[PDB]
Amino acid sequence: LEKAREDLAQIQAYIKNLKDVYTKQMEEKNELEMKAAKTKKKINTART
């Protein structure tokens, strides 16, 4: 019981660190998504 409690606590802490890294990641990836939008239609219209 004690060992499993400690293991679960460590796993939860690592999960929180990964979740914060994930937080910055999808914020930055959404910024890159909106940048990468609006130029595909631009290339299509340009080549039309």
Binding site: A4, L8, Y22, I43
Partner: protein, 48 residues
Amino acid sequence: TINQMEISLKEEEIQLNEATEKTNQLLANLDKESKKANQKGEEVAATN
């Protein structure tokens, strides 16, 4: 201009693929860790 918008789309798309690969690996690792956490918590609740 066509070359410019093409270049921007290319670089931003490859960066998007990289960040999405990062997000997918982090999500898979987090899902595995969450499964292990829930199973170990159920084991703890059992054990007591």
